[PDB]
Amino acid sequence: NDLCFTNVYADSFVIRGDEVRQIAPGQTGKIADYNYKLPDDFTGCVIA
């Protein structure tokens, strides 16, 4: 509530519980390697 930001992006998609934990910095797997990859210095939160 105190900070201010330049812009915010909401990336929305549907995944399954198996490997859903792979949405995180520095994770491996079919999704993290071939479908959606986060940068190492990602600053934000993932909600499910």
Binding site: P25, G26, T28, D40
Partner: protein, 48 residues
Amino acid sequence: GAISSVLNDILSRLDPPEAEVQIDRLITGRLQSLQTYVTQQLIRAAEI
């Protein structure tokens, strides 16, 4: 404290998110050894 003293062998087997932690130990250890050599040379030069 690193898993191996050869930098190329560790970088070739560990993933980037964890290899950076192991490499940092070798960088810190070698830099401190270099500073000790230089300091003793400054005192020895003053004697000559």
